[PDB]
Amino acid sequence: GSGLNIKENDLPGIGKKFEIETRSHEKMTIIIHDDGRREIYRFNDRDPDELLSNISLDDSEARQIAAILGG
Amino acid sequence: GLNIKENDLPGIGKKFEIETRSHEKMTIIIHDDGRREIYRFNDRDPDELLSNISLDDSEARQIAAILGG
């Protein structure tokens, strides 16, 4: 369906994983590590096995980018 | 270091060009009407787009909350 869909999973001892599907039907996974590290993975719209891009951010970077993204 | 360059796009919105500690690069366009567009480029080639995503205002805020949490 076409709305914002977020699936959250605990990664025991490691952090939290968020799998997001947007209204534009684009796919992203965000891992938030307990130590502060953020990892974002972008996958091919129609192929989960195909990684388009990925980025690792420390805590301060993630918060700065989040401030921009969300106003 | 984390480097951010902000420009105004007159009558359209704002552009943020971001370079991270990992040397990765992204451009975020924030439209006046609330749309966000995010572009990810090759670290060494500004001409090669790795990925892009379009978000509405609500989606942007929700994703920001996850990222900044």
Short mmCIF file of N, CA and C in Angstrom, two decimals:
data_model
loop_
_atom_site.label_atom_id
_atom_site.label_comp_id
_atom_site.label_asym_id
_atom_site.label_seq_id
_atom_site.Cartn_x
_atom_site.Cartn_y
_atom_site.Cartn_z
N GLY A 1 0.81 -1.21 0.00
CA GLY A 1 0.00 0.00 0.00
C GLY A 1 0.84 1.26 0.00
N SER A 2 0.20 2.40 -0.23
CA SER A 2 0.92 3.67 -0.34
C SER A 2 0.71 4.59 0.87
N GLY A 3 1.54 4.39 1.88
CA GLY A 3 1.66 5.29 3.02
C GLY A 3 3.08 5.13 3.51
N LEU A 4 3.41 5.72 4.66
CA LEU A 4 4.74 5.52 5.24
C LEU A 4 4.74 4.30 6.15
N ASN A 5 5.60 3.34 5.83
CA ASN A 5 5.66 2.06 6.54
C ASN A 5 7.03 1.89 7.16
N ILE A 6 7.07 1.74 8.48
CA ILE A 6 8.33 1.60 9.20
C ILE A 6 8.26 0.32 10.03
N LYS A 7 9.21 -0.58 9.81
CA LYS A 7 9.32 -1.82 10.59
C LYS A 7 10.55 -1.72 11.48
N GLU A 8 10.35 -1.85 12.78
CA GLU A 8 11.43 -1.74 13.73
C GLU A 8 11.73 -3.09 14.36
N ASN A 9 13.02 -3.43 14.39
CA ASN A 9 13.49 -4.65 15.02
C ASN A 9 14.65 -4.36 15.97
N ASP A 10 14.64 -4.99 17.13
CA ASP A 10 15.80 -4.96 18.01
C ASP A 10 16.86 -5.89 17.47
N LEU A 11 18.11 -5.43 17.52
CA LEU A 11 19.24 -6.30 17.25
C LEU A 11 19.92 -6.50 18.60
N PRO A 12 19.63 -7.63 19.27
CA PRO A 12 20.04 -7.83 20.67
C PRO A 12 21.53 -7.57 20.89
N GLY A 13 21.84 -6.67 21.82
CA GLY A 13 23.22 -6.37 22.18
C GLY A 13 23.91 -5.44 21.21
N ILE A 14 23.20 -5.05 20.15
CA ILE A 14 23.80 -4.26 19.07
C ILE A 14 23.12 -2.91 18.85
N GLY A 15 21.80 -2.92 18.72
CA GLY A 15 21.10 -1.67 18.47
C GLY A 15 19.70 -1.88 17.96
N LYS A 16 19.24 -0.97 17.11
CA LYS A 16 17.89 -1.02 16.56
C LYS A 16 18.00 -0.94 15.05
N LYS A 17 17.14 -1.67 14.35
CA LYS A 17 17.07 -1.61 12.90
C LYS A 17 15.69 -1.11 12.48
N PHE A 18 15.67 -0.12 11.59
CA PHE A 18 14.44 0.42 11.02
C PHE A 18 14.42 0.19 9.51
N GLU A 19 13.40 -0.51 9.02
CA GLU A 19 13.23 -0.69 7.59
C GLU A 19 12.06 0.19 7.17
N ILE A 20 12.33 1.11 6.25
CA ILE A 20 11.38 2.15 5.90
C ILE A 20 11.00 2.02 4.44
N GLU A 21 9.71 2.06 4.15
CA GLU A 21 9.27 2.19 2.77
C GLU A 21 8.44 3.45 2.70
N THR A 22 8.84 4.34 1.80
CA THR A 22 8.23 5.66 1.67
C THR A 22 6.98 5.65 0.79
N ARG A 23 6.31 6.80 0.72
CA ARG A 23 5.13 6.91 -0.13
C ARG A 23 5.54 6.88 -1.60
N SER A 24 6.78 7.28 -1.88
CA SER A 24 7.32 7.20 -3.23
C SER A 24 7.77 5.77 -3.57
N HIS A 25 7.56 4.85 -2.62
CA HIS A 25 7.93 3.44 -2.77
C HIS A 25 9.44 3.21 -2.83
N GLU A 26 10.18 4.07 -2.15
CA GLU A 26 11.62 3.93 -2.05
C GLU A 26 11.97 3.24 -0.72
N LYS A 27 13.10 2.54 -0.68
CA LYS A 27 13.42 1.64 0.42
C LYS A 27 14.71 2.02 1.12
N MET A 28 14.67 2.11 2.44
CA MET A 28 15.88 2.39 3.19
C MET A 28 15.91 1.63 4.52
N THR A 29 17.10 1.25 4.95
CA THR A 29 17.29 0.64 6.26
C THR A 29 18.21 1.53 7.06
N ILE A 30 17.82 1.82 8.30
CA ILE A 30 18.67 2.60 9.18
C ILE A 30 19.01 1.73 10.37
N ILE A 31 20.30 1.56 10.66
CA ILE A 31 20.73 0.87 11.87
C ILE A 31 21.22 1.91 12.86
N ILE A 32 20.64 1.92 14.05
CA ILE A 32 21.13 2.78 15.10
C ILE A 32 21.84 1.95 16.15
N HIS A 33 23.17 2.06 16.17
CA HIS A 33 23.99 1.31 17.10
C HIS A 33 23.94 1.91 18.49
N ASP A 34 24.05 1.05 19.49
CA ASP A 34 24.03 1.48 20.88
C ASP A 34 25.15 2.47 21.18
N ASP A 35 26.27 2.33 20.48
CA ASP A 35 27.42 3.22 20.70
C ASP A 35 27.31 4.58 20.00
N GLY A 36 26.22 4.79 19.26
CA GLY A 36 26.00 6.07 18.61
C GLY A 36 26.06 6.06 17.10
N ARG A 37 26.79 5.09 16.55
CA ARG A 37 26.92 4.95 15.10
C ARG A 37 25.57 4.79 14.41
N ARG A 38 25.38 5.51 13.30
CA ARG A 38 24.23 5.31 12.42
C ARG A 38 24.72 4.76 11.10
N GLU A 39 24.01 3.77 10.57
CA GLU A 39 24.29 3.30 9.23
C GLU A 39 23.01 3.39 8.44
N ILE A 40 23.09 3.94 7.24
CA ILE A 40 21.93 4.01 6.36
C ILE A 40 22.24 3.23 5.09
N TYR A 41 21.31 2.38 4.69
CA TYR A 41 21.45 1.63 3.46
C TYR A 41 20.28 1.95 2.54
N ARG A 42 20.58 2.20 1.27
CA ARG A 42 19.55 2.45 0.27
C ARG A 42 19.56 1.31 -0.73
N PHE A 43 18.40 0.72 -0.98
CA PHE A 43 18.32 -0.41 -1.89
C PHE A 43 17.56 -0.06 -3.15
N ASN A 44 17.83 -0.82 -4.21
CA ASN A 44 17.07 -0.70 -5.45
C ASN A 44 15.57 -0.81 -5.17
N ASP A 45 14.79 0.10 -5.75
CA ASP A 45 13.35 0.18 -5.51
C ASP A 45 12.65 -1.18 -5.63
N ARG A 46 13.09 -1.98 -6.59
CA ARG A 46 12.44 -3.25 -6.89
C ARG A 46 13.33 -4.48 -6.69
N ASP A 47 14.49 -4.29 -6.06
CA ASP A 47 15.39 -5.42 -5.81
C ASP A 47 16.13 -5.28 -4.49
N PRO A 48 15.68 -6.02 -3.47
CA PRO A 48 16.24 -5.95 -2.11
C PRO A 48 17.70 -6.39 -2.04
N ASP A 49 18.15 -7.16 -3.02
CA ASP A 49 19.52 -7.67 -3.03
C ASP A 49 20.52 -6.68 -3.62
N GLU A 50 20.01 -5.57 -4.13
CA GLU A 50 20.86 -4.58 -4.79
C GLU A 50 21.04 -3.33 -3.94
N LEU A 51 22.25 -3.14 -3.42
CA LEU A 51 22.58 -1.95 -2.65
C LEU A 51 22.93 -0.78 -3.57
N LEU A 52 22.21 0.33 -3.41
CA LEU A 52 22.46 1.53 -4.20
C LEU A 52 23.54 2.37 -3.54
N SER A 53 23.41 2.56 -2.24
CA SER A 53 24.37 3.38 -1.51
C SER A 53 24.31 3.05 -0.03
N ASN A 54 25.37 3.41 0.68
CA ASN A 54 25.37 3.30 2.13
C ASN A 54 26.27 4.34 2.76
N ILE A 55 25.93 4.75 3.97
CA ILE A 55 26.70 5.79 4.65
C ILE A 55 26.75 5.50 6.13
N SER A 56 27.89 5.78 6.75
CA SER A 56 28.01 5.63 8.19
C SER A 56 28.22 7.00 8.81
N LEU A 57 27.47 7.28 9.87
CA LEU A 57 27.54 8.58 10.52
C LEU A 57 27.78 8.36 12.01
N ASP A 58 28.61 9.19 12.63
CA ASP A 58 28.65 9.15 14.08
C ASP A 58 27.46 9.93 14.64
N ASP A 59 27.30 9.91 15.95
CA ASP A 59 26.13 10.50 16.61
C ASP A 59 25.94 11.99 16.30
N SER A 60 26.99 12.79 16.44
CA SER A 60 26.87 14.22 16.18
C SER A 60 26.52 14.51 14.72
N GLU A 61 27.08 13.73 13.80
CA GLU A 61 26.79 13.89 12.37
C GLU A 61 25.33 13.58 12.08
N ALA A 62 24.84 12.50 12.67
CA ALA A 62 23.47 12.07 12.45
C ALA A 62 22.50 13.12 12.96
N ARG A 63 22.80 13.70 14.11
CA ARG A 63 21.93 14.72 14.68
C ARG A 63 21.94 16.00 13.85
N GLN A 64 23.10 16.35 13.30
CA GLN A 64 23.21 17.55 12.49
C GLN A 64 22.43 17.37 11.19
N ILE A 65 22.56 16.20 10.58
CA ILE A 65 21.87 15.93 9.34
C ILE A 65 20.37 15.84 9.59
N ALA A 66 19.99 15.23 10.71
CA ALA A 66 18.59 15.13 11.09
C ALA A 66 17.97 16.51 11.29
N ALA A 67 18.72 17.44 11.88
CA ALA A 67 18.23 18.79 12.10
C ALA A 67 17.91 19.46 10.76
N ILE A 68 18.77 19.25 9.78
CA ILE A 68 18.55 19.81 8.45
C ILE A 68 17.35 19.14 7.81
N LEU A 69 17.33 17.81 7.86
CA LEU A 69 16.30 17.06 7.16
C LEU A 69 14.91 17.38 7.69
N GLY A 70 14.78 17.50 9.01
CA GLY A 70 13.49 17.66 9.63
C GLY A 70 13.13 19.07 10.06
N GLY A 71 14.04 20.01 9.81
CA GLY A 71 13.83 21.38 10.25
C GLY A 71 13.86 21.49 11.76
N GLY B 1 36.21 16.17 9.02
CA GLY B 1 35.22 17.03 9.63
C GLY B 1 33.94 17.15 8.82
N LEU B 2 32.84 17.46 9.49
CA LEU B 2 31.54 17.59 8.84
C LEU B 2 31.32 18.99 8.26
N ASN B 3 31.22 19.07 6.94
CA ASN B 3 31.17 20.37 6.26
C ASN B 3 29.82 20.56 5.60
N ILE B 4 29.16 21.66 5.91
CA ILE B 4 27.84 21.96 5.37
C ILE B 4 27.84 23.32 4.68
N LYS B 5 27.37 23.32 3.45
CA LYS B 5 27.23 24.53 2.65
C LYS B 5 25.76 24.72 2.31
N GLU B 6 25.19 25.83 2.75
CA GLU B 6 23.78 26.13 2.50
C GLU B 6 23.66 27.27 1.50
N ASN B 7 22.79 27.08 0.52
CA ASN B 7 22.43 28.10 -0.45
C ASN B 7 20.92 28.29 -0.51
N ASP B 8 20.48 29.49 -0.89
CA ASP B 8 19.07 29.69 -1.20
C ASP B 8 18.84 29.44 -2.67
N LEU B 9 17.74 28.76 -2.96
CA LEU B 9 17.25 28.63 -4.32
C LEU B 9 16.05 29.58 -4.43
N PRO B 10 16.27 30.78 -4.99
CA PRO B 10 15.20 31.79 -4.92
C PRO B 10 13.85 31.32 -5.45
N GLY B 11 12.81 31.50 -4.64
CA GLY B 11 11.46 31.14 -5.04
C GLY B 11 11.22 29.63 -5.01
N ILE B 12 12.24 28.85 -4.66
CA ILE B 12 12.13 27.38 -4.69
C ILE B 12 12.35 26.75 -3.31
N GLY B 13 13.40 27.17 -2.62
CA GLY B 13 13.70 26.57 -1.33
C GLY B 13 15.16 26.75 -0.95
N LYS B 14 15.72 25.73 -0.33
CA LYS B 14 17.11 25.77 0.14
C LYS B 14 17.86 24.52 -0.27
N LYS B 15 19.16 24.66 -0.51
CA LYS B 15 20.02 23.54 -0.86
C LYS B 15 21.12 23.41 0.18
N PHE B 16 21.30 22.20 0.71
CA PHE B 16 22.41 21.89 1.62
C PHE B 16 23.33 20.87 0.98
N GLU B 17 24.61 21.22 0.85
CA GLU B 17 25.60 20.28 0.38
C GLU B 17 26.42 19.84 1.59
N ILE B 18 26.41 18.55 1.87
CA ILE B 18 27.01 18.02 3.09
C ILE B 18 28.15 17.08 2.77
N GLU B 19 29.28 17.27 3.44
CA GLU B 19 30.39 16.33 3.36
C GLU B 19 30.71 15.80 4.76
N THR B 20 30.78 14.48 4.89
CA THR B 20 30.88 13.84 6.20
C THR B 20 32.32 13.53 6.60
N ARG B 21 32.50 12.99 7.81
CA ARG B 21 33.81 12.57 8.28
C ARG B 21 34.34 11.43 7.42
N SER B 22 33.43 10.59 6.94
CA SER B 22 33.80 9.44 6.12
C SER B 22 34.10 9.85 4.68
N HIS B 23 34.00 11.15 4.41
CA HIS B 23 34.25 11.75 3.10
C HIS B 23 33.13 11.49 2.10
N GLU B 24 31.97 11.10 2.62
CA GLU B 24 30.82 10.87 1.76
C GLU B 24 30.03 12.17 1.55
N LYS B 25 29.32 12.26 0.44
CA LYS B 25 28.68 13.51 0.06
C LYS B 25 27.21 13.34 -0.23
N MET B 26 26.43 14.29 0.26
CA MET B 26 25.01 14.30 -0.03
C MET B 26 24.50 15.71 -0.25
N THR B 27 23.44 15.83 -1.04
CA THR B 27 22.80 17.12 -1.25
C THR B 27 21.37 16.96 -0.82
N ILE B 28 20.89 17.90 -0.02
CA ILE B 28 19.50 17.88 0.42
C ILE B 28 18.83 19.14 -0.08
N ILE B 29 17.75 18.99 -0.84
CA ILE B 29 16.95 20.13 -1.27
C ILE B 29 15.70 20.17 -0.40
N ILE B 30 15.48 21.29 0.27
CA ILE B 30 14.23 21.46 1.00
C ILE B 30 13.37 22.50 0.31
N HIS B 31 12.30 22.02 -0.30
CA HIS B 31 11.37 22.87 -1.04
C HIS B 31 10.48 23.65 -0.08
N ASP B 32 10.07 24.84 -0.50
CA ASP B 32 9.19 25.66 0.32
C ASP B 32 7.89 24.96 0.65
N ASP B 33 7.43 24.11 -0.26
CA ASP B 33 6.16 23.41 -0.08
C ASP B 33 6.32 22.16 0.79
N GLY B 34 7.53 21.93 1.29
CA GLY B 34 7.77 20.84 2.22
C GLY B 34 8.49 19.61 1.69
N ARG B 35 8.50 19.44 0.37
CA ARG B 35 9.21 18.30 -0.23
C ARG B 35 10.70 18.34 0.07
N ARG B 36 11.26 17.18 0.43
CA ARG B 36 12.70 17.01 0.53
C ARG B 36 13.17 16.09 -0.57
N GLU B 37 14.26 16.46 -1.22
CA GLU B 37 14.95 15.57 -2.12
C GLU B 37 16.37 15.37 -1.63
N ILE B 38 16.80 14.12 -1.54
CA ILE B 38 18.14 13.81 -1.09
C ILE B 38 18.90 13.11 -2.21
N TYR B 39 20.12 13.57 -2.48
CA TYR B 39 20.95 13.00 -3.52
C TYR B 39 22.27 12.52 -2.93
N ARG B 40 22.67 11.30 -3.28
CA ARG B 40 23.93 10.75 -2.79
C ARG B 40 24.89 10.58 -3.96
N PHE B 41 26.08 11.12 -3.82
CA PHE B 41 27.05 11.10 -4.92
C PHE B 41 28.27 10.28 -4.57
N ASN B 42 28.95 9.79 -5.60
CA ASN B 42 30.23 9.12 -5.42
C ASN B 42 31.19 10.05 -4.70
N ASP B 43 31.96 9.51 -3.76
CA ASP B 43 32.86 10.33 -2.95
C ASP B 43 33.84 11.15 -3.80
N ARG B 44 34.26 10.58 -4.93
CA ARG B 44 35.25 11.23 -5.78
C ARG B 44 34.71 11.76 -7.10
N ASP B 45 33.47 11.41 -7.44
CA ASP B 45 32.88 11.86 -8.69
C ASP B 45 31.53 12.52 -8.46
N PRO B 46 31.50 13.87 -8.50
CA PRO B 46 30.28 14.66 -8.28
C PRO B 46 29.25 14.44 -9.37
N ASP B 47 29.69 13.89 -10.50
CA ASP B 47 28.83 13.70 -11.66
C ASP B 47 28.08 12.36 -11.62
N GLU B 48 28.51 11.46 -10.75
CA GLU B 48 27.87 10.15 -10.66
C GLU B 48 26.95 10.04 -9.45
N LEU B 49 25.65 9.94 -9.72
CA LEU B 49 24.64 9.83 -8.68
C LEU B 49 24.53 8.38 -8.22
N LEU B 50 24.67 8.16 -6.92
CA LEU B 50 24.57 6.81 -6.37
C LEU B 50 23.12 6.45 -6.10
N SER B 51 22.39 7.40 -5.53
CA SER B 51 21.00 7.16 -5.18
C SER B 51 20.33 8.48 -4.92
N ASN B 52 19.01 8.48 -4.97
CA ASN B 52 18.23 9.64 -4.59
C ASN B 52 16.89 9.20 -4.02
N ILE B 53 16.33 10.04 -3.16
CA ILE B 53 15.05 9.74 -2.53
C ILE B 53 14.22 11.00 -2.36
N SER B 54 12.92 10.87 -2.58
CA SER B 54 12.00 11.98 -2.41
C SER B 54 11.13 11.70 -1.20
N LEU B 55 11.02 12.69 -0.32
CA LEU B 55 10.25 12.58 0.90
C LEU B 55 9.26 13.74 1.03
N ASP B 56 8.06 13.48 1.54
CA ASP B 56 7.19 14.59 1.91
C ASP B 56 7.59 15.13 3.29
N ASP B 57 6.97 16.23 3.71
CA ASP B 57 7.39 16.89 4.94
C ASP B 57 7.25 15.98 6.16
N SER B 58 6.12 15.29 6.23
CA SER B 58 5.85 14.36 7.32
C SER B 58 6.86 13.22 7.36
N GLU B 59 7.18 12.67 6.20
CA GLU B 59 8.15 11.57 6.13
C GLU B 59 9.52 12.04 6.56
N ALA B 60 9.89 13.23 6.10
CA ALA B 60 11.18 13.81 6.45
C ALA B 60 11.30 13.98 7.96
N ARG B 61 10.25 14.48 8.59
CA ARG B 61 10.27 14.68 10.03
C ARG B 61 10.37 13.36 10.79
N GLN B 62 9.65 12.34 10.32
CA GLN B 62 9.69 11.03 10.96
C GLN B 62 11.06 10.37 10.80
N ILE B 63 11.63 10.46 9.61
CA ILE B 63 12.94 9.88 9.39
C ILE B 63 13.99 10.65 10.19
N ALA B 64 13.83 11.97 10.28
CA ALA B 64 14.76 12.78 11.06
C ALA B 64 14.74 12.36 12.53
N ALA B 65 13.54 12.10 13.05
CA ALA B 65 13.39 11.65 14.43
C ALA B 65 14.13 10.34 14.70
N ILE B 66 14.05 9.40 13.76
CA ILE B 66 14.78 8.14 13.87
C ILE B 66 16.28 8.40 13.85
N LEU B 67 16.72 9.19 12.87
CA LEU B 67 18.13 9.44 12.66
C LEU B 67 18.75 10.20 13.82
N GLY B 68 18.02 11.19 14.32
CA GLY B 68 18.53 12.07 15.35
C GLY B 68 18.24 11.58 16.76
N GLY B 69 17.67 10.38 16.86
CA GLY B 69 17.36 9.79 18.15
C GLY B 69 18.47 8.91 18.68
#
